Design a protein around this nucleic acid. Structure first.
Lengths: 81, 251, 60, 57, 50
RNA sequence: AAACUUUCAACAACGGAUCUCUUGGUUCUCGCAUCGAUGAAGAACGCAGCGAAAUGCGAUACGUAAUGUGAAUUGCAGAAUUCCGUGAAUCAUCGAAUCUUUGAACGCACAUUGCGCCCCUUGGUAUUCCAGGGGGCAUGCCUGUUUGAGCGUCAUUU
RNA sequence: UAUCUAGCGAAACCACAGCCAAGGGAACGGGCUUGGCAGAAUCAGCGGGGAAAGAAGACCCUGUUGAGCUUGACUCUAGUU
RNA sequence: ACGAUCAACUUAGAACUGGUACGGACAAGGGGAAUCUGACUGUCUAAUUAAAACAUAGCAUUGCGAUGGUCAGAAAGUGAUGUUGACGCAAU
RNA sequence: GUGGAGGUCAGUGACGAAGCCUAGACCGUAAGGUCGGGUCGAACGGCCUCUAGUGCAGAUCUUGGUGGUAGUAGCAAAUAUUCAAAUGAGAACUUUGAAGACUGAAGUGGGGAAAGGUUCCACGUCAACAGCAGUUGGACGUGGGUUAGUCGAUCCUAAGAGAUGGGGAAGCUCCGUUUCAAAGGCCUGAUUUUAUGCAGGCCACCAUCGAAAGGGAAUCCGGUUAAGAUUCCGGAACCUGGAUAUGGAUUCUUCACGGUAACGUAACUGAAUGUGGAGACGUCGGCGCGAGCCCUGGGAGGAGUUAUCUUUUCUUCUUAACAGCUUAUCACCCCGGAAUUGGUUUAUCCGGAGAUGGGGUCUUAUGGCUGGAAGAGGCCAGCACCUUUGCUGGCUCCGGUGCGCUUGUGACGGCCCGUGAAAAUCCACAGGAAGGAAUAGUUUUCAUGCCAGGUCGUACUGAUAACCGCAGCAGGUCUCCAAGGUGAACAGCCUCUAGUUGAUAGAAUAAUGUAGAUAAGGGAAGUCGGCAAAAUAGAUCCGUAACUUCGGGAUAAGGAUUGGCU
RNA sequence: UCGAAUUUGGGUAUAGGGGCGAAAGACUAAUCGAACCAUCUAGUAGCUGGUUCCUGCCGAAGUUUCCCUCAGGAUAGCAGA
RNA sequence: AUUGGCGAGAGACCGAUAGCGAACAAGUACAGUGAUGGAAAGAUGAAAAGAACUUUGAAAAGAGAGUGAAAAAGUACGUGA
């Protein structure tokens, strides 16, 4: 039986938690995150995966810093009071 | 069609040799000054089995000429070398069983083994169990020596290329018939996963050039040209002649 | 029994207690409370009474 | 518990009666959502890609 | 598992903190839309998939 | 003849169509040019008196500072001259800060909250061991500095 | 177990539905035509029928639709000489 | 010639006895004469085929002395056999 | 006829627009238009034009919703439940007690690995889930809970993975793992200019990751909680790292003595540099030994049984880590010199290369005695009599046996064309650098003394309900401990400790089934076919053919016996 | 079948024209005579199915010729405007 | 030039099965080991005035009472096929 008995046999984990992206997609044996490409410097994006970009492009996150550049540009990057 | 069994053997993966239990690379000493001018005296500390090799190994310990250290060299044993024997390796060494002599220094008809093919490497001829080479002749003006190899072929090699004196020992090994398939299984458990070996003509045509057909038959001539591309070379490759010899074929 | 910032270890817990409260601690045992926070059992020497110290801090 | 969650919510403005009423409403709403999900799933949850069907076809 | 990585137990603790119904006082706010906790993960129904 | 079945109406159900709205989307036009080793985008974990989420934020944590407005926030509690004022607000503006663990990610690593090393400092009879605090240690490359190597080589010198 | 009761309670299928004989008919009707007949509501079985249900027949053919595979088909090609 | 004391189940033998039963439940081989076929032990179509199919030991053939044979890589100062050397490796 | 647009009717409308319902009315042949009634609550229409995402019954159409089938199929594997009380609105299902039972130690028991993630535990509680029920729950609401120098990760390396220098590729990147590289870190004591050069020496090594089952420094008992534990508490130890004081030890013979020797000790300098050992290792068989368990006798307590019998049946009588002394097969040393060859194992091996014999040396696995430690724990008795339940008493002793079972282990034997890891780390040895002489000093592998030991995991399940199979699924998932009887047996059947008594029930007993049996006479006549079933079956003894590769065939075939009791 | 070519955990390697195969086209996450995911892609169809309001008037063809043409077109013809 | 970013103005556009997938705690819940796949879900009323109080019931609720212009608006909430 390749169905119910085999599905019992599975208890390991091929993938675990990636450090750069929180997805449980970091391949343990290959040591690469199948989603974000970590530890490769370039985050794994592809043009055939338009949704894949849409889920992780700029705008899905806090933007701890990029939010305020528009204000700083609107005022001309002033300084002081 | 599919990549056939012999094709995918070159990629490695599961077809690499099983080197865990081996004692090391069995090689003569490096052609240093002492060994190329005179001789040096090692002591055969121990003789050990080496998995996947049919012949025992002799661990000969030498004094380093240039420091305190003692260097352990792993020779392929020669029938008659025993633990505690002194091994003299080099040009000035006398002609006693187990010693290493450059082929220029050994008279015609001497029986050597583990012969350095080109001076400087560390043994390349007559290393399998019970094999040897015969010193056919000398050319002192050209620093060459004719030798007879285990296959029956003559070869001219530099007379300063070393070789150990005697026979490789462990001989007669292939005379005992393995009876169980387990004997071959344990034989090839320590050798590179060559076994068992599915016959091609039982394979399906996608798997092997012989495969397929309502009868197990090759259907095309099994002799394959030297110039056939990889993936076509299955069966008798570049055969000069097939069939039973039915002749003396020399001794 | 204290809640301790998870960045702290046994030495820092020992030094902090000796500083915040003028007491000497016998030994420190710590665990990560299942809600994700350090929990420290700080045992004082035999010359201090934790019951007096606890009510001095302000919990009975 | 010198102070209980009952007290920490009575200060927050939900009495016991209102807490029970609201909890009942949430439980009921969640059960309604489960009813709807079962309704909408039963139609297509049985669609297996590679069911072998012993007596094929 | 019995032997846990510290990272796994951190996610553990996050789920325990999250596993609770709505704070009741939220329902009384003006223009309140939240009817109930819709992300209520529970161990019998949905695994954390970590 | 009842029952039952069927059709219709009324009322009541199941269901959420129709109608009416719309802080959304889509398309067009106009204007502007501003991410990041001064650590970006992204991620994990935490933060509220009472919050799980969304939003905001980083141990200074639904935020601090500055400036403007000028009396609220609000579900409850609390605060209440805090309001004829350097002053409320989940206000707006935003030029000073904080900015956990990460992440190009940068001491080495990582499925470890693992292992170093250096300077200053403090404690423990301590330059050496241990511990706390502070500051650092990536690579490629450019210019320059300093120390060098080579019978590659010049001259001087015994 | 089936059966009867308390509780719980689905699925397949379903144009409308359901008594036959013959006739003609897309050459084997539940309906059409001529006859036989024909009285509510039903229970447990039953396997004749509903050309019963399950799947846009896999057998066969057509497609100027493929794919696996072979060769001495056509045209190329890695390697190699 | 040889005495005292302590402690095991293991085999045989004999009576007596019984509604001739007694491996009393449980446990627990059907055998013989052959023929086809595959030597055997072993393995595979997980979920319709466990076989006479595959494998195997044995036998035989082929290539190769490393500047090599067989094979891999897009390339490389690349790699498997090879920690190898014809009593070996490779293809049958 | 519909959505929208331009114009117009100063169009209709909260005194009710749009919509929706209406076997009520009117108009048109029709698409459709109009009106009344009800419901309703904020927009909408006629006409002249414009514009299109503009008209549904189908498409195995898409989405959403609902039927008949139908209170039907069914809720039937895992032996099995029954009585009373309590609680409650309500009890077949909850709780307690009483029975009856099972799992039967290769368990339904007691712990873990992977995995799950709070399921653990308490109080409250039933809306939903628990395919019946529910007061109950792995459910719902709110909280509590996981304590380590010694257990693991951490450290090592394994098959492998993978940077740097290099070299390819347009390129994301690829090869490679010590290589065509100018690759650094230890010992110091130091100059007191200074950096970390150094007195300067040494080293030439070759980044790093890879095991919660391999290697590895060090811990045990007793007690304790609602839930923790080799972690807490009491008590008792050890290891590592570090300062180190005292005592001992050692010398004018500077770096100890003794023994013939194997070798002994409380110690008893020792760099660079090398050597060696440990780490470090297959599998099976029988044998010796130990531990734990099992069986059993005496005796000191309790319980049960007692028509009768029973010196009875059941039960407690235990000693941890760690420390001192002692303890061993093997091995080795000395004396001696062997044929009348001897010693000896279950197993044939050993001796002039020195046997047997006499006497010694060692390893301390291991057992014994003692300290730990009876003060614990256990079992009883008496008095207090809500008490943490207290207080006080005793006893806790001496043996026996074995092809017993599990396990550890020693010396051996067999097998291989199989000879069955590596590294960290630790030690020792060779060498003799350097240092130390008369209070001169050297050490400090001896005893005692002092300080510290971080981070992370620690609850629970581990499965007919906590993992995966869409679920509370007869499936699947690695492992440890294993009582008594029968019996060859961790087979089958029954029991002890422990755990459950869970699976929707009640009433009848038709057909057809599923599962389990038996059938007179015949005995394959059934059938594609002896398919299914039946027969034989354990053990001891007798007997055993053809053929054969001489090993087999073979338990051939075929017969006899089988208890109990003395 | 049950001591071995045995069974099995964990780690590790091989990845799609590729792996792996004691060889069945087997296995490669219920997928295998070429896995899974996304994009090119609304791929093309001489083939099947559907193709939504009313009324009025007119109202046929399955034939000629040519096509790798024979389930289809072009061409005339028939039909409307 | 501009389907990205920031800020604006508009439409013979769509009007909750439409329009982006998302008018909402939407790239969320959820499935898959992973690449990825990926929804559903708006409307009480002007104002909660969200039904004090009595009564039957163990309780949920029911019957009265009451708020409201309207419970033929009762958080299952416009209309309600």
């Amino acid at each position: 039986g390749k169905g119910t008995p085999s599905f019992g046999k599975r208890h390991n984990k091929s993938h675990t938690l990636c450090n750069r992206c929180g997805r449980r997609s970091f391949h343990v044996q290959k040591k690469t995150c199948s989603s974000c490409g970590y530890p490769a410097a370039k985050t794994r994006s592809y043009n055939w995966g338009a949704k894949a970009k849409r889920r992780h492009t700029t705008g899905t996150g806090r933007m701890r810093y990029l939010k305020h550049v528009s204000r700083r540009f609107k005022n001309g990057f002033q300084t002081g009071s | 069609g599919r990549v056939i069994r012999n094709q995918r053997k070159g990629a490695g993966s599961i077809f690499t040799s099983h080197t865990r239990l081996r004692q090391g690379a069995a090689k003569l000493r490096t052609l240093d000054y002492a060994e190329r001018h005179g001789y040096i005296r090692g002591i055969v500390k121990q003789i050990v089995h080496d998995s996947g090799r049919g012949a025992p190994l002799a661990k000969v310990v030498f004094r380093d000429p240039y420091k305190y250290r003692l260097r352990e060299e792993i020779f392929i044993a020669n029938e008659g070398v025993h633990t505690g024997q002194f091994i003299y390796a080099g040009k000035k060494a006398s002609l006693n069983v187990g010693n290493v002599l450059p082929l220029g220094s050994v008279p015609e008809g001497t029986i050597v083994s583990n012969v350095e093919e080109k001076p400087g490497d560390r043994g390349a001829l007559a290393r399998a169990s019970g094999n040897y080479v015969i010193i056919i002749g000398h050319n002192p003006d050209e620093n060459k020596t004719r030798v007879r190899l285990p296959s029956g072929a003559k070869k001219v090699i530099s007379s300063d290329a070393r070789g150990v004196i005697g026979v490789i020992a462990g001989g007669g090994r292939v005379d005992k018939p393995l009876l169980k398939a387990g004997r071959a299984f344990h034989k090839y458990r320590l050798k590179r996963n060559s076994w068992p070996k599915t016959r091609g003509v039982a394979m399906n045509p996608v798997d092997h050039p012989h495969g397929g057909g309502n009868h197990q038959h090759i259907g095309k001539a099994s002799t394959i040209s030297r110039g056939a591309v990889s993936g076509q070379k299955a069966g008798l490759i570049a055969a000069r002649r097939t069939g039973l010899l039915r002749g003396s074929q020399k001794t | 029994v204290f809640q301790v910032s998870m960045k702290a270890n046994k030495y820092q817990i020992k030094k902090a207690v000796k500083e915040l409260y003028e007491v000497d601690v016998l030994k420190v045992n710590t665990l990560v409370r299942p809600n994700g926070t350090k929990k420290a059992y700080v045992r004082l020497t035999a010359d201090y009474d934790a019951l007096d110290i606890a009510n001095r801090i302000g919990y009975i | 518990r010198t102070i209980t969650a009952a007290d920490r919510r009575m200060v927050s403005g939900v009495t016991e009666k209102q807490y029970k009423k609201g909890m009942k409403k949430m439980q009921q709403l969640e059960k309604n959502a489960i009813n709807t999900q079962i309704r909408r799933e039963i139609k297509r949850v049985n669609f297996q890609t590679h069911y072998r069907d012993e007596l094929l076809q | 598992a019995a032997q846990k990585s510290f990272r796994i137990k951190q996610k553990m603790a996050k789920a325990k903190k999250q596993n609770r119904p709505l704070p009741q006082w939220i329902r009384l706010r003006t223009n309140n839309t939240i009817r109930y906790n819709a992300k209520r993960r529970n161990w019998r129904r949905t695994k954390m998939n970590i």
